[PDB]
Design a protein around this ligand. Structure first.
Ligand SMILES: [Cl-]
Ligand SMILES: [Cl-]
Ligand code: NA
Length: 129
């Protein structure tokens, strides 16, 4: 599923991400836009052989099991394929654990380099929330 901007904003809010660990909803939307372009089926392989899955490109190195990432963990206790669903519940639940890990949203590369510090409220401008 490719979400629209305000649609994902609403789904993220309904799933409790708005202001989770202090991060306003426009930071989550902005991170999704640059990680997956709002596509829940996005997958991208990393050089170390791990893969990132879903709207928030959660990495099999630590967070989900895909069966082909040696030495990794599955701290969200989920198959990485659950992260590609049209229903974002598993991605959101697993992102809450990631954002609580000690480094905040800096866990997402693209958020640190493309969202952090910018006018992220623009990502939810005009949306019915
Ligand atoms: Cl594995
Ligand atoms: Cl923080
Ligand atoms: Na894993």
């Amino acid at each position: 599923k490719v979400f629209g901007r305000c649609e994902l904003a609403a789904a993220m809010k309904r799933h409790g991400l708005d202001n989770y660990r202090g991060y306003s909803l426009g930071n989550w939307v902005c991170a999704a836009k640059f990680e997956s372009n709002f596509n829940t089926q996005a997958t991208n392989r990393n050089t170390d052989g791990s893969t990132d899955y879903g709207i928030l490109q959660i990495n099999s190195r630590w967070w989900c099991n895909d069966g082909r990432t040696p030495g990794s963990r599955n701290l969200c206790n989920i198959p990485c394929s659950a992260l590609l669903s049209s229903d974002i519940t598993a991605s959101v639940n697993c992102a809450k654990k990631i954002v609580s890990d000690g480094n905040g949203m800096n866990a997402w590369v693209a958020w640190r380099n493309r969202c952090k510090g910018t006018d992220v409220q623009a990502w939810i401008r005009g949306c019915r929330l």
